[PDB]
Swiss-Prot record, chain A:
Acts both as a substrate recognition component of E3 ubiquitin-protein ligase complexes and as an atypical serine/threonine-protein kinase, playing key roles in various processes such as cell cycle, telomerase regulation and histone modification. Probable substrate-specific adapter of a DCX (DDB1-CUL4-X-box) E3 ubiquitin-protein ligase complex, named CUL4A-RBX1-DDB1-DCAF1/VPRBP complex, which mediates ubiquitination and proteasome-dependent degradation of proteins such as NF2. Changing residue 169 to A: Loss of interaction with DDB1, no effect on interaction with TET3. WD repeats lie at residues 13-52, 55-96, 98-135, 137-169, 170-212. It is found in: Cytoplasm; Nucleus; Cytoplasm, Cytoskeleton, Microtubule organizing center, Centrosome. Residues 13-212 are annotated as: WD repeat-like region. A motif (DWD box 1) lies at residues 164-171. Disulfide bonds: none annotated. The modification Phosphoserine is found at residue 238. Component of the DCX (DDB1-CUL4-X-box) E3 ubiquitin-protein ligase complex, named CUL4A-RBX1-DDB1-DCAF1/VPRBP complex. Interacts with DDB1; the interaction is direct. Also forms a ternary complex with DDA1 and DDB1. Interacts with NF2 (via FERM domain). Component of the EDVP complex, a E3 ligase complex containing DYRK2, EDD/UBR5, DDB1 and DCAF1. Interacts with DYRK2; the interaction is direct. Interacts with RAG1; the interaction is direct. Interacts with LLGL1 and LLGL2. Interacts with histone H3. (Microbial infection) Interacts with HIV-1 virus Vpr protein; the interaction is direct. A motif (DWD box 2) lies at residues 200-207. Ubiquitously expressed. This is DDB1- and CUL4-associated factor 1. Induction: Up-regulated in a number of cancer cell lines (at protein level). The lineage of its organism: Eukaryota, Metazoa, Chordata, Craniata, Vertebrata.
Length: 297, 295
């Protein structure tokens, strides 16, 4: 099940402005982005604010800490730059920024690269230099997904951008997956064998259709760290509706639907896959007044 | 560093017959199984025996207290039942697992027991004692001679005989190939890796990550933060030899080799990893429990 064990808001703000979250490398701490462009560190159990940093001059949409705790990616709404890489060692400082990329992720195996998305286009950057190594766009193969989000596979040898599979080493498109929806561009399964593009599950080896899972329509997905559970939430303002769903990652069978009856902004699980944090707005309310709810998994 | 503090010896015996050890949940006592099937509780502060319970009609091989202090698993050598579950809140037998020679609790939520009978895993409900699942796929068996089935940290997966199972679907996901005759493997507490003898496998992709020669024929246990792994090599009598090794749990690099110069039967640490208890043969049998400061 998912048992709520705590809730908190942005401390001492009239309107609580949490927009996104990720568990920090430090146990007991959650990092939260806010609608005024700040990064907050909270004790997730006590709900007390620890620290605050200034990142953007507009709402943070999404963030991702590196596994080693040294780096953080943020993206914002209408700032220039739209995304940035922060050091979180001795001093919190901007290392590099990614001009017009509205979404960024780390590489997965070795976190030495950042992949950013601008519309239909992927940009790959070196963390050390900040240099743009690659621009991935093929006019013949584009799907023009409206919510495209480029991503590396588990071993960093492949990229999925706009439903197109790229060999990173050669910088060549090797396969275009056919289009079935307007918005969702897809992710790699952590098993390294399958790609999940909206409702379609494709075999990475043969490019054959393995399964159709209608409940995944218009969902963003995240796996737990052990790769046993997949969380999906349907896109809707707030990014998501009021529900998320879990699936068995090993067979795509549904486990549970959780409807919190309030718009969801983000969801994350800790490295030990014991806790879920969900940002929820206090349906389709005009007032921004979010809370972070912590669930025991 | 492991600095010896003191020894618990079996009260009123010329030779001590301890075979296994665990700290109690709240850690006021050490729980020590014996070669005649008794469970003895020793006060850690005073060193004195506070209780002795008749658990099995053969030597206790292994035991595991539940984290909440309410339950204890035991396993024994011969006869029947080979394993049992005991209530710690009057001491009594709750359930027995007649043919399972090894048992463990589930890890994330301790509502289940997993037992091993040869190549077969059995999962039981703690409350009812009912067998919920039997996991065995003859297509995939490795027939490890010292197979011990185990849950992963989230309880979503089981490793049995080197085969990875999805518990929810009760389906074998993957067979890890066989490179030794005995050791069937464990999950790393980090949730990312499987440790099967000398092979470290990626849990998600199943690719080989590392070879760790020093782990050959070892049983392992981690500190409670999962930063240190203890390993002791089975004997080709004492289950282990006279040394154990510690390893950095993140990179599998050795930290220390501890030569006890006495054969080891078991070891355990407390929740805060301040203490290590080791069952050591002083004799040759005279198996005492030596307590060490960790460190
Ligand atoms: C108005 C402006 N605001 C936004 O646009 C805000 C955008 C935005 N917020 C969170 C995410 C997001 O994808 N979160 C991931 C988890 C993660 N942290 O990666 C997620 C996966 C499964 C889930 F069930 C839930 Cl609920 C969330 C997203 C998001 C939404 C869509 C896309 Cl294409 C990409 C995204 F990152
Ligand atoms: C000899 C005739 C009969 N006797 C036995 O068979 C006796 C069997 C037996 N005793 C202790 C264990 C055991 O695995 N202990 C664990 C710690 C724990 N408590 O889980 C351990 C981990 C790392 C170590 F460095 C040490 Cl030293 C011990 C074991 C044991 C040994 C092998 C296997 Cl497959 C399973 C086991 F439980």
């Amino acid at each position: 099940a998912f048992r709520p064990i705590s809730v908190f808001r942005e401390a001492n703000e009239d309107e609580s402005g949490f927009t996104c979250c990720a568990f920090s490398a430090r146990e007991r701490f959650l990092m939260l982005g806010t609608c005024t462009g700040q990064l907050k560190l909270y004790n997730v159990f006590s709900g007390q604010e620890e620290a605050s940093y200034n990142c953007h001059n507009s709402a943070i949409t999404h963030l991702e800490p590196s596994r080693d705790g040294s780096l953080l990616l943020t993206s914002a709404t209408w700032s220039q730059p739209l995304s940035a890489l922060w050091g979180m060692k001795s001093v919190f400082d901007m290392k590099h920024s990614f001009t017009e990329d509205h979404y960024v992720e780390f590489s997965k195996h070795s976190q030495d690269r950042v992949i950013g998305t601008k519309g239909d286009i992927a940009h790959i950057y070196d963390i050390q230099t900040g240099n743009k190594l690659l621009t991935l766009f093929n006019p013949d193969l584009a799907n023009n997904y409206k919510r495209n989000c480029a991503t590396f596979n588990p071993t960093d040898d492949l990229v999925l951008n706009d439903g197109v599979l790229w060999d990173v080493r050669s910088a060549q498109a090797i396969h275009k997956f056919d289009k079935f929806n307007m918005n969702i561009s897809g992710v790699f399964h952590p098993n390294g064998l399958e790609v999940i593009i909206n409702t379609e599950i494709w075999d990475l080896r043969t490019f054959h259709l393995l399964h159709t899972v209608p409940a995944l329509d218009q969902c963003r997905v995240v796996f737990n760290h052990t790769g046993t559970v997949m969380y999906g939430a349907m896109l809707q303002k707030s990014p998501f509706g009021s529900s998320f769903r879990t699936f068995n990652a090993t067979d795509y069978k549904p486990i549970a639907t959780i409807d919190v009856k309030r718009n969801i902004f983000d969801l994350c699980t800790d490295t030990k896959d014991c806790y879920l944090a969900v940002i929820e707005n206090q349906m389709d309310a005009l007032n921004m007044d979010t809370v972070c709810r912590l669930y025991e998994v």
